[PDB]
Design an enzyme around this catalytic site. Structure first.
Site, mmCIF file in Angstrom:
data_model
loop_
_atom_site.group_PDB
_atom_site.id
_atom_site.type_symbol
_atom_site.label_atom_id
_atom_site.label_comp_id
_atom_site.label_asym_id
_atom_site.label_seq_id
_atom_site.Cartn_x
_atom_site.Cartn_y
_atom_site.Cartn_z
ATOM 1 N N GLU A 170 0.834 -1.188 0.000
ATOM 2 C CA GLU A 170 0.000 0.000 0.000
ATOM 3 C C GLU A 170 0.885 1.260 0.000
ATOM 4 O O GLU A 170 0.595 2.227 -0.714
ATOM 5 C CB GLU A 170 -0.933 0.009 1.203
ATOM 6 C CG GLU A 170 -1.968 1.108 1.112
ATOM 7 C CD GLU A 170 -2.533 1.497 2.450
ATOM 8 O OE1 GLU A 170 -1.752 1.589 3.419
ATOM 9 O OE2 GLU A 170 -3.756 1.729 2.533
ATOM 10 N N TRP A 227 -8.617 -1.982 -0.048
ATOM 11 C CA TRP A 227 -9.335 -0.870 -0.670
ATOM 12 C C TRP A 227 -10.473 -1.259 -1.611
ATOM 13 O O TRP A 227 -11.015 -0.408 -2.324
ATOM 14 C CB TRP A 227 -8.342 0.002 -1.448
ATOM 15 C CG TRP A 227 -7.531 0.914 -0.595
ATOM 16 C CD1 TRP A 227 -6.262 0.706 -0.143
ATOM 17 C CD2 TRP A 227 -7.938 2.190 -0.089
ATOM 18 N NE1 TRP A 227 -5.855 1.772 0.613
ATOM 19 C CE2 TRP A 227 -6.863 2.700 0.666
ATOM 20 C CE3 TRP A 227 -9.112 2.952 -0.198
ATOM 21 C CZ2 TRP A 227 -6.924 3.942 1.313
ATOM 22 C CZ3 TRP A 227 -9.174 4.183 0.442
ATOM 23 C CH2 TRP A 227 -8.085 4.666 1.189
ATOM 24 N N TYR A 240 -4.764 9.887 -1.215
ATOM 25 C CA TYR A 240 -3.354 9.991 -0.813
ATOM 26 C C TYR A 240 -2.308 10.061 -1.932
ATOM 27 O O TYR A 240 -1.609 11.065 -2.076
ATOM 28 C CB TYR A 240 -2.987 8.837 0.121
ATOM 29 C CG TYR A 240 -3.864 8.707 1.338
ATOM 30 C CD1 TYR A 240 -3.686 9.545 2.436
ATOM 31 C CD2 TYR A 240 -4.862 7.725 1.405
ATOM 32 C CE1 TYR A 240 -4.472 9.412 3.574
ATOM 33 C CE2 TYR A 240 -5.651 7.585 2.541
ATOM 34 C CZ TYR A 240 -5.451 8.429 3.620
ATOM 35 O OH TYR A 240 -6.218 8.296 4.752
ATOM 36 N N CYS A 254 -7.978 9.494 6.469
ATOM 37 C CA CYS A 254 -8.015 9.370 7.913
ATOM 38 C C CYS A 254 -6.665 9.776 8.488
ATOM 39 O O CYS A 254 -6.606 10.340 9.583
ATOM 40 C CB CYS A 254 -8.501 7.990 8.387
ATOM 41 S SG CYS A 254 -7.362 6.593 8.258
ATOM 42 N N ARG A 289 -7.027 12.179 11.883
ATOM 43 C CA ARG A 289 -8.300 12.763 12.275
ATOM 44 C C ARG A 289 -9.273 11.721 12.786
ATOM 45 O O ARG A 289 -9.904 11.894 13.828
ATOM 46 C CB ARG A 289 -8.925 13.547 11.115
ATOM 47 C CG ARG A 289 -9.174 12.748 9.861
ATOM 48 C CD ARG A 289 -10.507 13.121 9.248
ATOM 49 N NE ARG A 289 -10.865 12.235 8.146
ATOM 50 C CZ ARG A 289 -11.882 11.374 8.166
ATOM 51 N NH1 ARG A 289 -12.674 11.296 9.222
ATOM 52 N NH2 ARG A 289 -12.118 10.605 7.108
ATOM 53 N N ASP A 310 -9.557 4.100 13.701
ATOM 54 C CA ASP A 310 -10.223 2.873 14.082
ATOM 55 C C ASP A 310 -9.105 2.176 14.860
ATOM 56 O O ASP A 310 -8.174 1.628 14.269
ATOM 57 C CB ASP A 310 -10.608 2.101 12.822
ATOM 58 C CG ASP A 310 -10.983 0.658 13.089
ATOM 59 O OD1 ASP A 310 -11.297 0.291 14.240
ATOM 60 O OD2 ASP A 310 -10.960 -0.115 12.113
HETATM 61 C C1 LIG Z 1 -6.140 2.217 7.986
HETATM 62 C C2 LIG Z 1 -5.973 1.726 6.903
HETATM 63 C C3 LIG Z 1 -5.634 1.089 5.616
HETATM 64 N N1 LIG Z 1 -6.717 0.177 5.213
HETATM 65 C C4 LIG Z 1 -7.780 0.533 4.256
HETATM 66 C C5 LIG Z 1 -8.360 1.866 4.224
HETATM 67 C C6 LIG Z 1 -9.722 1.806 4.586
HETATM 68 C C7 LIG Z 1 -10.434 2.891 5.096
HETATM 69 C C8 LIG Z 1 -9.790 4.110 5.229
HETATM 70 N N2 LIG Z 1 -10.438 5.184 5.701
HETATM 71 C C9 LIG Z 1 -9.896 6.409 5.656
HETATM 72 N N3 LIG Z 1 -10.623 7.446 6.067
HETATM 73 N N4 LIG Z 1 -8.631 6.558 5.208
HETATM 74 C C10 LIG Z 1 -7.887 5.476 4.877
HETATM 75 O O1 LIG Z 1 -6.551 5.611 4.587
HETATM 76 C C11 LIG Z 1 -8.457 4.217 4.840
HETATM 77 C C12 LIG Z 1 -7.747 3.110 4.365
HETATM 78 C C13 LIG Z 1 -7.093 -0.937 5.940
HETATM 79 C C14 LIG Z 1 -8.013 -1.857 5.374
HETATM 80 C C15 LIG Z 1 -8.454 -3.000 6.037
HETATM 81 C C16 LIG Z 1 -7.974 -3.261 7.307
HETATM 82 C C17 LIG Z 1 -8.351 -4.514 7.865
HETATM 83 O O2 LIG Z 1 -9.416 -5.079 7.604
HETATM 84 N N5 LIG Z 1 -7.464 -5.082 8.660
HETATM 85 C C18 LIG Z 1 -7.007 -6.455 8.455
HETATM 86 C C19 LIG Z 1 -6.216 -6.589 7.140
HETATM 87 C C20 LIG Z 1 -5.733 -8.006 6.855
HETATM 88 C C21 LIG Z 1 -5.137 -8.168 5.474
HETATM 89 O O3 LIG Z 1 -5.107 -7.179 4.704
HETATM 90 O O4 LIG Z 1 -4.699 -9.296 5.151
HETATM 91 C C22 LIG Z 1 -6.097 -6.740 9.643
HETATM 92 O O5 LIG Z 1 -6.481 -7.599 10.458
HETATM 93 O O6 LIG Z 1 -5.032 -6.080 9.754
HETATM 94 C C23 LIG Z 1 -7.080 -2.372 7.937
HETATM 95 C C24 LIG Z 1 -6.645 -1.220 7.253
#
Ligand SMILES: C#CCN(Cc1ccc2[nH]c(N)nc(=O)c2c1)c1ccc(C(=O)N[C@@H](CCC(=O)O)C(=O)O)cc1
Ligand SMILES: C#CCN(Cc1ccc2[nH]c(N)nc(=O)c2c1)c1ccc(C(=O)N[C@@H](CCC(=O)O)C(=O)O)cc1
Lengths: 264, 264
Positions: A58, A80, A94, A146, A166, A169
């Site tokens: 990423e 994504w 980004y 975020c 900002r 999660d």
């Molecule tokens: C934050 C962020 C980037 N991202 C995605 C993403 C999603 C929403 C966002 N929301 C906003 N506002 N900005 C972001 O940069 C953003 C990025 C993520 C996506 C999924 C997981 C998740 O489900 N976690 C699993 C992933 C496992 C895998 O990929 O194999 C985990 O258990 O870690 C975490 C982060």
């Protein structure tokens, strides 16, 4: 990590039950900060196994200035997927803002190249920032950034970086961002011949989703293990030439991973 | 104020000697966060006499979307003179970015009104932010913004605010900015029928100029007095209709003022 877990407990004990966009519900606190000395080890969560392949790809996707998930897919990264349109685009998120911030007069600004040049020529600068918060393009983005803004700093040959998030999660997103920026600092330091320093995390709406309560309680019972170390096998010609193969996380002995539903 | 004096001591105790653009030399630390509960009292430095007049007029100037010192002069405020050109212009700084951030497609966004809309219609939003950091206009600005970004938050009928100051002159600037932002929160809360919560200050390059050391220690030898109280004598039809004469600061008994040279 001790810091990460203490923040979790903090959200549990002090959080305010807030209704959220998704209509899921979240325990939330506003305003928090934590410091991670990179000289002590890579801040990858040990109380739950984290997936580095997604974190690395990423970031390389960002630096390329790409906003299409095709690259992510080519490398099995689906994070994504839920936000990209029929064509895989996410709008000028980004990647676009880092490498091609659009001026009102038509020009574009490469904030990464600018940062590199500042770290090399003017390290004492208090203006070494990269911002993803482009107010004029927010409405075209599939989602509002975020991890909105960040700033570099150099003192005693060490490179530090503060990240303003900002919206956070705590369970899913947070561990990912810490590792992501910690990686960037390492890549930047190597490129600018500087030692790594502190990575400071600052957040606004730090929240825990109601449907993650159990997973949180579970993780909170695990004793944190020593932090791993990062190895950069090769030094590319530019911060833009890194490859997935170039990184290694030594000494990473994490507890089993914990699965939790995604809030879209 | 206790928090203020504590930051000063931190800078002195853990600071790193760093040179700066102005060529003066500073003691610097990177990354700090402090919280002020607006319910306790108006956060105005009492260990040195502060000039409310300059603070209030600047804020009203900002909200007007004005970027020419003419208004300030009409009210005997000269705090921005050193950076204004022959015509009194400073470029698209604060006022402009807040009331009319230019977009690449010819539009302009009024971030103040947008934020007012969110506070009333979507207070649980995690996107209630005003940014002055317009990467694509920095070159037109007389000075790159210090208090570059801020986020509002609502919970339990209380309005909070977090500001990210990238470069902070601890002795001169900080006391002005804190009083300035607390004023803004009170104004917003009154327009949205909210009570005042916390002002969370976050700084990047937090420093003290080498030529302020004696004045700093002089101030540190002082006991903070009780915090003054703010009384707003009227509820204007809109946030942009406030007048200097609507604000009353009560119970402000500060220690003598200490003069210290500005770094241009
Ligand atoms: C934050 C962020 C980037 N991202 C995605 C993403 C999603 C929403 C966002 N929301 C906003 N506002 N900005 C972001 O940069 C953003 C990025 C993520 C996506 C999924 C997981 C998740 O489900 N976690 C699993 C992933 C496992 C895998 O990929 O194999 C985990 O258990 O870690 C975490 C982060
Ligand atoms: C922050 C801010 C605004 N400003 C000016 C100002 C100057 C440089 C900046 N630099 C940047 N990049 N952003 C800013 O917001 C900024 C603002 C201030 C300027 C001067 C004093 C000052 O000279 N202090 C005198 C005031 C005396 C009086 O007004 O009666 C003192 O002795 O305290 C304080 C604040």
């Amino acid at each position: 990590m001790k810091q990460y877990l203490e923040l979790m407990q903090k959200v549990l004990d002090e959080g305010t039950q807030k209704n959220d966009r998704t209509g899921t519900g979240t325990l939330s606190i506003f305003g928090h900060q934590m410091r991670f000395n990179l000289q002590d080890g890579f801040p990858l969560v040990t109380t739950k196994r984290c997936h580095l392949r997604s974190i690395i790809h990423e970031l390389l996707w960002f630096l390329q200035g790409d906003t299409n998930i095709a690259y992510l897919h080519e490398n099995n990264v689906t994070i994504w997927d839920e936000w990209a349109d029929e064509n895989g685009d996410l709008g000028p998120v980004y990647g676009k803002q880092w490498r091609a911030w659009p001026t009102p007069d038509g020009r574009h600004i490469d904030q990464i190249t600018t940062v590199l040049n500042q770290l090399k020529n003017d390290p004492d600068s208090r203006r070494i920032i990269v911002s993803a918060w482009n107010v004029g393009e927010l409405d075209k983005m599939a989602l509002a950034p975020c991890h909105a803004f960040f700033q570099f700093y150099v003192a005693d040959g060490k490179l530090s970086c503060q990240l303003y998030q900002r919206s956070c999660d705590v369970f899913l997103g947070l561990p990912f961002n810490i590792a992501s920026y910690a990686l960037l600092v390492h890549m930047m330091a190597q490129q600018c011949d500087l030692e790594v320093g502190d990575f400071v995390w600052t957040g606004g709406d730090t929240h825990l989703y109601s449907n993650h309560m159990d997973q949180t309680h579970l993780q909170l019972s695990r004793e944190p293990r020593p932090l791993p170390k990062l190895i950069i096998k090769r030094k590319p010609e530019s911060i833009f030439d890194y490859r997935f193969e170039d990184f290694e996380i030594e000494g990473y002995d994490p507890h089993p991973g914990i699965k939790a539903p995604v809030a879209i």
